[PDB]
Design a protein around this ligand. Structure first.
Ligand code: CLA
Ligand code: CLA
Ligand code: CLA
Ligand code: LMG
Ligand code: LMG
Ligand code: LMG
Ligand code: LMG
Ligand code: SQD
Ligand code: SQD
Ligand code: LHG
Ligand code: BCR
Ligand code: FE2
Lengths: 504, 30, 96, 48, 37, 342, 57, 59, 67, 37, 57, 37, 30
């Protein structure tokens, strides 16, 4: 009897039913994409693109549709918040319906290619046995890959015939779907340059076509054919599994580190923007320039976009979640309602204090207020018996500039402590924890979840490379080793290992 | 949730109909 | 104790992989290799000399147990001795 | 719940008292007991 | 001991499977609305 | 008349005392440098300018406290070549910058590939199955996730485990305090794999030794064996009946038993590797929210989980100031969480 | 002053959408999902066990 | 029980420059003199039109 | 035994005919090794740019290059 | 416009080739000097 | 009567009890019941289908 | 006709059933606390 | 309700253990 872990090996040497089995996975994957999109559209709230973006609602496939140009819904709304203008077929609902319809067609084709497995196409004309000319098939299917790679970068991304791709400003404030022009110089290899994407898919497409032509014309070397077992289709599986986990590692790195293909306006900020003070530095710079124009601190902070401030909140950091804190970031800390304005903490003598921001590594972090030169001046003491820095005996007050609480100042220690705790999380926002009953613990964005999933898949698929790779090479000994082997395995019997013609 | 469970039950029932018609046990004479 | 369990885990994996790598062909590829062994067999189900040859070349000839009895005593002694000492360690640390 | 530290601060370790499989435990004997033998018959009540 | 002489083997043809699957799903469709209530 | 590949293949796969093979071209260079880098780093190279610590014998450390420490956090994930923009060709400054860690980590990671290729190379030559190479994927998964993937998800190489005994202990205690790594279900499966494999190693070794057939007249039973003997050395039937009446269940298939001895340890390390991949993103199983909600609302509900949560807070606060000097954390003692007395 | 009225001031709806344009989140016992799931899988498995046994002859 | 990989079953020099009814691959061999001459002529005739066409539309 | 013949099958049949045909010896292996070496160098260069171990004047390698 | 970091990257690639060439050269020399048959 | 409505709550507690002092734990996912049920039954059924098929031959 | 020559029969002995059932249940025991959270 | 799931899972595992010991396939010599 066949073991349960070798059941799907019956199509190993059946090209007709291998296509049928591969058509079924294709039907399911497109079926999932359509089903996933429809669910997300049933839960997504497009009313507030600034304080309730996609990445705060746990939307996973919505950013990927938006990344390539899908921005409008049949419901009449646009992802940017403007009103839809004749969405046409290719809406969020249309793309979801298309992947669903495709799923049904692939399901039907799978049944046909399964019932009619005994096609003369899959027969070796020399031996009349089922066989696939894998070196030629690879050239065919690579030429299509090169052709499709070229067209995506030359028509779709470039904008010649297509929507372009999502391009954002450096601080994720103003991002739209634009037609990007290929950048052919060294800046084309800048990961944060969207012009490199069009240039790459054009050049790799051209080389993909030419490589497909070569691999379609030139027969493999005899030595390479035997060394790589090119007559065995499990060789293709080993190399494909190797290539797909290489791509999974790369695609996880560019998601975690950020690139032009993972805009923060679609997937949320990266953990390194919080670590390096990417948004905080920009916010202080804009406020400082407005102060240089002789504007009041109350009105300079009011100029700061609320979208920019929301990025400076540690709750939007993708490295603050948990493996089993499931759901949307809204389910963790609530739905963002409004900015409370910048909180500036002042000593009793008037010196300004800064709350030490919480590093990403800390689940909890002591609240400590520093002055300009970095010296600890006040804090919330754990031991309130002989404290020397408690805000009560330092007279710390908090005043808010901009936002909802602009102008309002608090002096009682209880509220000053409350906002000091909020201040170490970055900017202070008002959250609605009643609609979805948020617990109060942070969650990861789609950036975090995508990275974890495709890193775990990448690691598991390395074992696949080793297993399926060892299976094809060691196929002749899969059921066991030869009975009489001792003479060859003897130490020193032969000069060269294995070679029986090199007897010592 | 209910709307998701109603749709799965309905399409699940439709899926059975498809298999009962095309993937049926063929009636064979003797 | 850590060397006992890390080593024991290493030796379990090595012994299991070396015996599995040396299974004498007695089945087809549509059956489990386990089927090649019949409970109560009087003959050996894997080639010890072949496994020793592999591990002999893997590091060097004399780093491998040619003797199944010595090998299995080593498989038992290493984790047991290691766990004996870590059990003593907690016992000694009981008296500070 | 069991007063493990002898400081009259019981620690819940049962499933029916709010623990899951990972956090559930049989709490060690109270620190007030020490190494003293504490069979069920040396207690005034089974609640104690 | 000696084997039991009352041994039998249960059978379910494919058409019975489709009837059984149809009944379970149809009955679920019927009662799901009421169970959710 | 043979070509270069054939004449070279003849020499590389010569059956000598230490087999070289084609994979030896990658293994022995990289493995020697990784070994040499560690011995050199633990003996002469300091971590004074990277961690503010002494980590060499020359500085006064012993085998337990010497280590090849990671670069400073300001270096990020720099590969830190000898010729890179950091320590541009200056060997001594390269050592002071922690560049020896990436040297050991990189040449060490390619040695693991070389050794696994060596297992494939020898197994094909000896004409046996490649299950030792498959078993070696588990240690590689552990090394790849712990020494490469985890720091790559963090700020930089600084948070990777430094190559040392006490340095690994700090890495271990860091994971408890910051990640609650014991509570993670993937270390739990890793523990069960390692402890289960240690159990199988001991129980199988003892079972074989105590079911041995009498193949000699000497009390020394080790000598009564021949590697080429066809008969089995121990009674599987007695072994099977022993464990069936002692434990209730026993192995009846010799092949299955040895595969299980291979599956338990490998699966354990692989599951543990998945968990560390999650910690790379701080995607950790730190806490049970339901109990935290209950504990916050009810100040009398205490479990061993909540006690551990307070222990982690102590670890993080009392360790961050020195373990993370780049953060420049000056905590006055009044703000550190401390219990009564002690 | 206190931000207790800030969340109240959010009269403009700010929440993930309900399945209906007129909002569909009604009080149905979630035990219905489990009851429907068990009523489907348990008898389905029973039938599949008997059919696969029969189909294998 | 044993699935050995295939070995050299023989050396053959296929006859090139043999056109068949196969629409997708008419010639017997890719590397044939007559197939290349058709490629040389077709590539060449396209270039002759292109070289003149580029000049004329520019002027 | 010939299998089911279809119009699409006869059209695509030439593409699945030369199953075992190989070039004798090493063929174009050395040429393949050249491209792998160039590809390896290309992969290194783009890795260094992203890792910031190679600093190019025009590239900035940060979010600020989105401007 | 080659930065010094770019030059070292090119130098590292060349140095890597020399190390590989030195390895291959030594192996080919010994393999020919010490040949079987 | 709202005074008497809240009089009972602050006074002797309401009904339906709870396991031990408190075991509501409404934060519990509840969807974990479906996740645990589906993760048990679906693979269990798969194993039972194969065993009954095997045991009958 | 021409039945497919690649037919195989899956097999699962009783000891594999116990190992499978133990794995499914012990995995649920391990992960249920986290899914419930 | 979680307590119901936890208890069922635990006693379910012990049920499998009981059956594996007594309702096992007996090891029969060849
Ligand atoms: C006409 C066909 C078609 C079209 C136009 C689309 C379009 C779309 N799909 Mg869909 N899909 C299709 C077919 C199609 N799909 C089929 C047949 C399946 C079944 C497999 C799917 C399964 C699927 C899923 C699961 C998902 C989509 C999604 C999407 C949306 C985002 C795509 C994206 O950004 O991902 C990016 C695409 C890539 C990154 C491809 C990378 C290419 C790799 C790296 C190849 C590299 C190796 C290559 C061989 C190198 C050699 C060649 C080279 C040398 C030249 C988008 C609107 C996503 C979505 O938004 O959900 C609705 C989603 O998750 N699709
Ligand atoms: C690469 C694949 C992928 C990724 C990255 C995501 C990512 C995401 N999904 Mg998702 N999804 C996927 C595939 C994926 N999905 C598939 C294949 C399905 C079909 C089942 C779904 C169906 C789905 C739904 C219905 C929802 C999401 C939601 C979400 C978002 C919340 C993430 C979350 O909380 O998960 C949490 C993950 C965990 C709590 C545990 C991870 C799995 C563990 C690590 C494996 C352990 C083994 C297993 C669990 C043991 C079982 C034991 C037993 C007791 C259960 C998030 C961005 C939610 C959302 O935000 O809505 C917008 C949402 O409701 N997804
Ligand atoms: C097979 C043995 C081997 C291997 C695999 C490695 C691998 C590695 N070494 Mg190491 N090393 C070795 C032997 C080896 N070394 C030896 C014998 C020594 C002398 C003792 C050193 C001394 C050494 C030092 C001092 C350092 C390294 C470093 C490194 C790492 C990065 C360096 C690098 O590869 O950049 C370059 C990448 C390449 C050279 C790719 C090669 C591809 C081929 C050769 C291209 C062919 C070139 C040819 C001219 C064609 C021109 C193409 C054209 C486009 C230009 C890397 C993982 C660095 C490190 O440890 O990082 C911290 C480092 O500082 N090594
Ligand atoms: C084979 C698979 C190929 C996968 C990539 C091919 C291109 C896929 C997207 C093409 C597309 O969406 O066309 C969509 C386009 C335009 O289609 C229109 O798009 C508008 C966008 O605002 C509106 O949404 C309209 O509703 C929609 O009809 O149709 C074409 O003209 C493509 C014709 C070329 C297709 C054949 C070559 C490929
Ligand atoms: C960059 C360049 C990349 C080249 C990738 C292809 C390398 C060759 C693959 C097939 C190997 C082979 O011949 O059969 C596989 C080889 C040779 O198999 C046969 O062996 C015979 C003797 O038993 C003879 O030597 C035959 O010539 C030989 O073909 O098998 C082995 O030697 C076992 C170990 C193989 C390890 C990999 C060797 C290749 C590594 C580097 C190649 C460098 C340069 C090659 C030029
Ligand atoms: C197949 C058929 C048989 C299925 C059997 C059932 C198996 C169940 C296994 C667990 C599935 C559920 C997981 C937890 C679900 C949950 O927590 O609540 C349910 C959650 C959703 O959770 C809810 O979401 C809501 C918004 O829609 C709200 O935010 C709620 O607050 C929130 O609780 O569903 C998920 O998000 C899970 C989707 C899957 C995500 C996978 C990410 C990781 C992907 C791959 C990892 C790869 C490798 C890992 C290692 C191996
Ligand atoms: C596969 C890969 C296999 C190969 C991997 C790499 C192999 C060897 C790598 C080393 C070779 C040099 C590579 C860089 C080449 C280069 O461009 O130069 C890079 C720099 C160039 O020189 C530097 O350039 C800088 C930038 O312009 C500045 O100008 C500096 O002033 C200048 O010194 O020099 C080096 O880094 C080469 C250092 C060579 C050191 C060899 C190893 C030393 C080992 C022990 C020494 C012990 C004690 C010495 C001290 C006392
Ligand atoms: C409609 C779309 C899918 C909806 C799914 C909804 C779920 C409920 C319906 C399906 C479950 C009930 C079917 C029972 C099958 C049965 O008893 O006959 C067994 C059939 C009959 O064919 C076998 O084929 C044999 C030929 S051979 O031996 O295989 O060559 C032949 O003897 C004879 O036909 C028969 O024995 O055997 C099969 O080969 C069928 C494949 C296994 C069943 C697949 C179930 C899942 C379907 C897809 C699910 C995902 C849907 C989304 C798609 C993107
Ligand atoms: C969500 C799932 C529920 C989880 C429940 C967990 C607890 C139970 C786990 C059971 C798992 C084992 C299944 C396979 C067992 C097997 O193959 O048996 C082997 C024997 C062999 O057959 C018999 O064999 C006998 C001898 S021998 O066994 O063949 O040697 C022979 O004489 C006789 O003719 C023949 O019929 O099978 C049986 O006949 C056993 C009885 C049928 C199985 C019933 C199991 C369910 C019991 C109810 C549990 C729930 C309620 C409990 C309340 C107290
Ligand atoms: C007298 C006191 C008894 C002490 C108690 C002993 C407990 C017995 C436990 C065995 C049940 C496991 C069944 C294995 C499934 C089974 O019965 O397979 C039976 C199997 C026999 O395999 P064979 O040699 O027959 O294999 C032939 C091939 O067909 C293999 O497929 O025995 C073993 O694999 C040995 C491993 C036993 C060790 C089991 C691991 C430890 C149990 C873990 C329990 C989890 C904790 C639960 C707590 C809630
Ligand atoms: C026939 C036909 C039709 C219809 C069709 C359809 C209806 C389709 C769809 C289908 C579908 C509707 C599909 C879906 C699917 C789904 C899937 C396929 C999923 C799965 C899942 C998974 C696989 C997951 C797993 C996991 C979990 C659970 C946990 C965590 C981890 C993971 C994630 C891994 C039409 C009308 C067109 C017409 C024509 C014909
Ligand atoms: Fe053994």
């Amino acid at each position: 009897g066949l073991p349960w872990y070798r059941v799907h090996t019956v199509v190993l040497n059946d090209p007709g039913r291998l296509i049928a089995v591969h058509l079924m996975h294709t039907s399911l994957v497109s079926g999932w994409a359509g089903s996933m999109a429809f669910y997300e559209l049933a839960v997504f709230d497009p009313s507030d693109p600034v304080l309730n973006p996609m990445w705060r609602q746990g939307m996973f496939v919505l950013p990927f549709m938006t990344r390539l140009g899908i921005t409008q819904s049949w419901g009449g709304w646009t992802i940017s918040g403007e009103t839809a203008s004749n969405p046409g077929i290719w809406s969020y609902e249309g793309v979801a319906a298309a992947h669903i319809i495709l799923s049904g067609l692939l399901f039907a084709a799978s049944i046909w290619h399964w019932v009619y497995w005994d096609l003369e196409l899959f027969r070796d004309p020399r031996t009349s046995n089922p066989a696939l000319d894998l070196p030629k098939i690879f050239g065919i299917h690579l030429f299509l890959s090169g052709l499709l790679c070229f067209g995506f970068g030359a028509f779709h991304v470039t904008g010649l015939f297509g929507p372009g791709i999502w391009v954002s400003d450096p601080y994720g404030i103003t991002g739209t779907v634009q037609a990007v022009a290929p950048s052919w110089d060294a800046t084309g290899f800048d990961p944060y340059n969207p012009g490199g994407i069009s240039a790459h898919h054009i050049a790799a497409g051209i080389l993909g076509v030419l490589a497909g032509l070569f691999h379609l014309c030139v027969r493999p070397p005899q030595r390479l054919y035997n060394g790589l077992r090119m007559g065995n289709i499990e060789t293709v599986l080993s190399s494909s599994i190797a290539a797909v986990f290489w791509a999974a590692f790369v695609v996880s790195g560019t998601m975690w580190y950020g690139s032009a293909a993972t805009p923060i306006e679609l997937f949320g900020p990266t953990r390194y923007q919080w670590d390096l003070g990417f948004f905080q530095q920009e916010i202080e710079r804009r406020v400082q320039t407005s102060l240089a124009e002789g504007k009041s601190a109350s009105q300079a902070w009011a100029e700061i976009p609320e979208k920019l401030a929301f990025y400076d909140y540690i709750g939007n950091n993708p490295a603050k979640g948990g493996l089993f804190r499931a759901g949307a970031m809204n389910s963790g800390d609530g739905i963002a309602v409004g900015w409370l304005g910048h909180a500036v903490f002042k000593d009793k003598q008037g010196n300004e204090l800064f709350v030490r921001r919480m590093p990403t590594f800390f689940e909890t972090f002591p609240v400590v207020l520093l002055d300009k030169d970095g010296v600890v001046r006040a804090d919330v003491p754990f031991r309130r018996s002989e404290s020397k820095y408690s805000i009560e005996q330092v007279g710390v007050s908090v005043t808010f500039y901009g936002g909802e609480l602009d102008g309002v100042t608090f002096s009682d220690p209880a509220t000053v402590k409350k906002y000091a705790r909020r201040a170490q999380l970055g900017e202070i926002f008002e959250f609605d924890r009643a609609t979805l009953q948020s617990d109060g613990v942070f969650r990861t964005s789609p950036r975090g979840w995508f990275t974890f999933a495709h890193l775990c898949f990448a690691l598991l698929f390395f074992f696949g490379h080793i297993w399926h790779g060892a299976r094809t090479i060691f196929r002749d000994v899969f059921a066991g080793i030869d009975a009489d082997l001792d003479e060859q395995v003897e130490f020193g019997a032969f000069l060269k290992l294995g070679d029986t013609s090199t007897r010592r | 949730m209910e709307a998701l469970v109603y749709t799965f039950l309905l399409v699940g029932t439709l899926g059975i109909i498809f298999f009962a018609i095309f993937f049926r046990e063929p009636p064979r004479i003797v | 104790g850590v060397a006992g369990v890390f080593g024991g885990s290493l030796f379990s994996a090595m012994h299991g992989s070396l015996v599995t790598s040396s299974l004498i062909r007695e089945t087809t590829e549509n059956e489990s290799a386990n089927e090649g062994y019949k409970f109560g067999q009087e003959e050996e189900t894997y080639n010890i000399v072949a496994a020793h040859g592999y591990f002999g070349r893997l590091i060097f000839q004399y780093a491998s147990f040619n003797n199944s009895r010595s090998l299995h005593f080593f498989l038992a002694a290493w984790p047991v001795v290691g766990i004996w000492f870590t059990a003593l360690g907690i016992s000694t640390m009981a008296f500070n | 719940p069991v007063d493990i530290d002898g400081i009259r601060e019981p620690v819940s370790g049962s499933l029916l008292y709010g623990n899951n499989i990972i956090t559930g435990a049989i709490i060690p004997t109270s620190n007030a007991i020490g190494l003293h033998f504490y069979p069920i018959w040396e207690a005034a009540s089974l609640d104690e | 001991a000696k084997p039991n002489p009352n041994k039998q083997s249960v059978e379910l043809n494919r058409t019975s499977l489709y009837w059984g699957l149809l009944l379970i799903f149809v009955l679920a469709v019927l009662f799901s609305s009421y169970i959710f209530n | 008349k043979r070509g270069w590949f054939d004449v070279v293949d003849d020499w590389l796969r010569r059956d000598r005392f230490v087999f070289v093979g084609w994979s030896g071209l990658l293994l022995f260079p990289t493995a020697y440098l990784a070994l040499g880098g560690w011995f050199t780093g633990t003996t002469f190279v300091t971590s004074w300018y990277t961690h503010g610590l002494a980590s060499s014998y020359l500085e006064g450390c012993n085998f337990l406290t010497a280590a090849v420490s990671t670069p400073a956090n300001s270096m990020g994930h720099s590969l830190l070549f000898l010729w890179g923009p950091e320590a541009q060709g200056d060997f001594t400054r390269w050592c002071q910058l922690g560049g020896l860690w990436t040297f050991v980590a990189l040449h060490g990671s390619f040695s693991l590939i070389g050794f696994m290729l060596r297992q494939f190379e020898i197994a094909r030559s000896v004409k046996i199955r490649p299950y030792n190479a498959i078993a070696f994927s588990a240690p590689i998964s552990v090394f790849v996730s712990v020494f490469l993937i985890y720091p790559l998800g963090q700020s930089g190489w600084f948070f990777a485990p430094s190559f040392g005994v006490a340095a690994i202990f700090r890495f271990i205690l860091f994971f408890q305090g910051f990640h609650n790594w014991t509570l993670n279900p993937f270390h739990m499966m890793g523990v069960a794999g390692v402890l289960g494999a240690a159990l199988l190693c001991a129980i199988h070794g003892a079972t074989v030794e105590n079911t041995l057939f009498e193949d000699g007249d000497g009390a020394n039973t080790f000598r009564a064996f021949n590697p080429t003997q066809a008969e089995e050395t121990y009674s599987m039937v007695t072994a099977n009946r022993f464990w069936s009446q002692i434990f209730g269940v026993a192995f009846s298939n010799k092949r299955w038993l040895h595969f299980f001895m291979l599956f338990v340890p490998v699966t354990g390390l692989w599951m543990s590797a998945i968990g560390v991949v999650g910690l790379a993103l701080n995607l950790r199983a730190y806490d049970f929210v339901s109990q935290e909600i209950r504990a916050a609302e009810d100040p009398e509900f205490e479990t061993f989980y909540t006690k551990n949560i307070l222990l982690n807070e102590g670890i993080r606060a009392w360790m961050a100031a020195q373990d993370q000097p780049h953060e420049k954390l000056v905590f006055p003692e009044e703000v550190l969480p401390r219990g009564n007395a002690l | 002053x206190x931000x207790x009225x800030x969340x109240x001031x959010x009269x403009x709806x700010x929440x993930x959408x309900x399945x209906x344009x007129x909002x569909x989140x009604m009080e149905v016992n979630i035990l219905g999902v489990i009851a429907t799931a068990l009523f489907i899988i348990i008898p389905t498995s029973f039938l599949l066990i008997l059919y696969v046994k029969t189909a294998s002859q | 029980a044993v699935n050995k990989a295939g070995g050299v079953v023989g050396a053959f020099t296929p006859v090139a420059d043999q056109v068949s009814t196969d629409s997708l691959a008419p010639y017997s061999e890719v590397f044939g003199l007559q197939r290349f001459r058709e490629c040389e002529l077709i590539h060449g005739r396209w270039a002759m039109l292109a070289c003149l066409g580029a000049l004329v539309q520019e002027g | 035994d010939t299998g089911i013949s279809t119009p699409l099958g006869t059209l695509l049949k030439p593409l699945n005919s030369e199953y075992g045909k190989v070039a004798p010896g090493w063929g174009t292996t050395v040429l393949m090794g050249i491209f792998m070496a160039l590809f390896a160098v290309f992969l290194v260069i783009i890795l260094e740019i992203y890792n910031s171990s190679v600093l190019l004047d025009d590239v900035t390698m940060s979010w600020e290059s989105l401007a | 416009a080659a930065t010094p970091s770019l030059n070292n990257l090119i130098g590292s690639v060349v140095a890597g080739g020399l190390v590989l060439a030195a390895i291959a050269g030594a192996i080919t020399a010994v393999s020919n000097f010490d040949s079987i048959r």
